[PDB]
Amino acid sequence: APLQLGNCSVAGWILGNPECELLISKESWSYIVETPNPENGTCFPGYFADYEELRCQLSSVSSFERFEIFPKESSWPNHTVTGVSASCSHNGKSSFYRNLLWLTGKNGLYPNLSKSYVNNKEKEVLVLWGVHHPPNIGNQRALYHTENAYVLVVSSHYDRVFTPIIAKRPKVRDQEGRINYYWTLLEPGDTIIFEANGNLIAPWYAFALSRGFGSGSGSCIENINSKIYHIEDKIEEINRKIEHILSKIYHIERKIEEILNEI
Amino acid sequence: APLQLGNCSVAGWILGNPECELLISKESWSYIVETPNPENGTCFPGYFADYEELRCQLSSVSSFERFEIFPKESSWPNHTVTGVSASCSHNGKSSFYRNLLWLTGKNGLYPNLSKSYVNNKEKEVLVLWGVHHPPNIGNQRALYHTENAYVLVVSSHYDRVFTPIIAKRPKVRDQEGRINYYWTLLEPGDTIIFEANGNLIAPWYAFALSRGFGSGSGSCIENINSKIYHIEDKIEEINRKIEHILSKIYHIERKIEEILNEI
Amino acid sequence: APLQLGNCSVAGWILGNPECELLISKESWSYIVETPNPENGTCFPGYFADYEELRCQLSSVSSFERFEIFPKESSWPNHTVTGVSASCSHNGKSSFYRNLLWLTGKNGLYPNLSKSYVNNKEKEVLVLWGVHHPPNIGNQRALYHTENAYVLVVSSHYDRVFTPIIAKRPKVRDQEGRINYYWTLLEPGDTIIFEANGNLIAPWYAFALSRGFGSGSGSCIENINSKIYHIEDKIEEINRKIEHILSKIYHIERKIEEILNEI
Ligand SMILES: *[C@@H]1O[C@H](CO)[C@@H](O)[C@H](O)[C@H]1NC(C)=O
Ligand SMILES: *[C@@H]1O[C@H](CO)[C@@H](O)[C@H](O)[C@H]1NC(C)=O
Ligand SMILES: *[C@@H]1O[C@H](CO)[C@@H](O)[C@H](O)[C@H]1NC(C)=O
Ligand SMILES: *[C@@H]1O[C@H](CO)[C@@H](O)[C@H](O)[C@H]1NC(C)=O
Ligand SMILES: *[C@@H]1O[C@H](CO)[C@@H](O)[C@H](O)[C@H]1NC(C)=O
């Protein structure tokens, strides 16, 4: 069960790259296949935090449900949700990652938000979000009506603050700015809180994972230790087989000595 | 030598969780056993930095001495050391981690401190400390008489600055705030300096480790490479045994051909 | 091909420690040998970021060219480039890392710089730079004529901001201050931009690597997974050999039963 992934990255699949037709009735898997140099991976350029840990941790998964965490129509009543660009153009139309919503202001000044979610799925929940990094102060003002903004994310067992870095970057996918991505896991009974006054790429969809019992915490360091441990056991088994055959070879030799003794 | 640890985490054992009766005349070990879902692990909720590296690095230890680094009675002459709470209640009495001291103000305004320690143990020293993160600005003022504080920690080969994040978190162990934990190692001849004007969970006890020669730097990446290297050697050994028996099987066959030739 | 490295660290070799005579016509290698406790490793005390990843990632390299990225004589027309100290004294003369330039002010106030490089080598480029951390505000003013400075580094796929920490550290190599080191990799077609208004240890030389096809991304987690995978294949091979010999031992026994039956 390597999954159906084609010329996509893991990030493209979970973020919702418009070009990855992976939104099918596919549940569990034992390994994830992805293309090292994908075409449908990155949609909008930026750094994906702890990518290696996420792709490693997700290597073994049971039930895999995609569900709404902060529904587009009701979660941000007076925010702009038409956060689209040429970067994610699909069939000629401007767009964005399906599981994310890039929020901007309208009419007046971009208001600040505070939203939360409680995990009642009896599954672990993977929440993805990002941080906007404008190429120029002019856009920081145009989008959020501010020269200063922060994003605060906390949860039962998580504390992080993000700040924007405003600078012109090398042109990538025709963009001068960047969007970085971050993620956390929630256990049943936990809560996540999002507070921001600008530059927030809000979570829309989240993944509820049963995961199963094929791993521990899921940290890549544990997954690798598991493989090594497993190998060590195979080595002891073969060592026993060696002693077994050495003994038998010994006995069979003895008879060769005797059949000879008979003549 | 797996150690005597019961329903405790490594963090609970080294931080001094009141419920972990591990303070006995126990020295060296070859592996640390701990409970994946402990009851006496976390005392006061928060994030433990580089936990995986610390538990991995400590997997092999020689002499293990617990000693005072900054004695409660003399290290902070005009600070409040009665830093206790319900979170660590023991036998009905409010308390805290045994190896840590949560400092607060009194009488006037919480003064700033600057303390240092020089490693003259001829052993490597593990120093644990934490950072307070109030649920509300009201408590930041009540405890340290400030709306702004920082913690600076430097050593021969370490440079880090911590800042508080003030926010209401999901309720964990009846707390709305958090305490994060950080740690460093000192070599013989080194020095550590602690500077703070608030939100410091000061070190009280520290551990002097001889460690031994069963590892290199102790980084988990090296410990795992050591295991792999060790396996590779076992593989070469068994491969030699295979060639040995193949040769002998060949010779024994030859005689089977001849004893047959005799008849 | 372990390389010619003697009593040097990897950092000393790539940073350009005056005492490491490694600047010879040496190209590719299959492993890097270094001294665990070197004399010619550290030149000026400080923390080297992601050292383990860099030494691991460079374990397998093809063509290895050292070239100028920001030539000393033309890249900073009105900056001081005589950034030398006793720490790197060579043959009695004050000096510094050969591949780095420590910039300071002169005449007037230290001006701010903005420099960039585009990778047109058809190779991946390793760029090394550092950040100055004065022991005292007095030196921050004396060197850069400021009480506040920042270093901004961005690239096609990199975003980081550094700030100075001004404090007196434990004396190491006769220094009270520190210089930290950071590094990035550029792919062909990428760009790196350096912006600073003080405390910049500028890049002078950079390394153009062909790397080869003996690894993937080069992250240490992948290099280790490769070794484990390789071992697993060896195990399957030996398991087949075991079945082979067990079958043959069986047949040879049968004849031993019959030669006996003949008598
Ligand atoms: C992936 O790219 C190859 C060409 O390199 C193409 O033939 C194939 O159809 C692509 N697959 C998908 C799912 O786009
Ligand atoms: C905007 O929506 C928030 C709820 O998300 C509400 O509290 C606030 O008063 C609204 N502001 C306006 C101008 O409607
Ligand atoms: C940010 O939140 C404050 C309340 O803490 C509110 O007064 C202010 O108007 C908000 N900012 C914007 C742009 O609405
Ligand atoms: C650990 O928990 C079990 C119950 O799950 C209990 O029987 C045992 O006594 C506990 N051990 C300690 C040291 O508390
Ligand atoms: C508080 O103690 C410090 C030493 O730790 C001392 O320097 C300072 O003067 C004392 N302040 C008062 C009011 O006693």
Ligand SMILES: *[C@@H]1O[C@H](CO)[C@@H](O)[C@H](O)[C@H]1NC(C)=O
């Ligand atoms: C903090 O240190 C300064 C000296 O640098 C001192 O003047 C000030 O009073 C200290 N703060 C408090 C609350 O004592």
Ligand SMILES: *[C@@H]1O[C@H](CO)[C@@H](O)[C@H](O)[C@H]1NC(C)=O
């Ligand atoms: C390394 O140190 C040893 C002494 O421990 C010395 O004999 C040797 O010549 C040194 N090698 C180099 C390259 O300095």
Ligand SMILES: *[C@@H]1O[C@H](CO)[C@@H](O)[C@H](O)[C@H]1NC(C)=O
């Ligand atoms: C210093 O050099 C920069 C170019 O690196 C130039 O733009 C600036 O005008 C120069 N300043 C002076 C005073 O020459």
Ligand SMILES: *[C@@H]1O[C@H](CO)[C@@H](O)[C@H](O)[C@H]1NC(C)=O
């Ligand atoms: C820093 O850059 C600004 C322009 O953005 C310039 O006006 C200022 O003089 C520079 N600082 C110094 C010390 O030259």
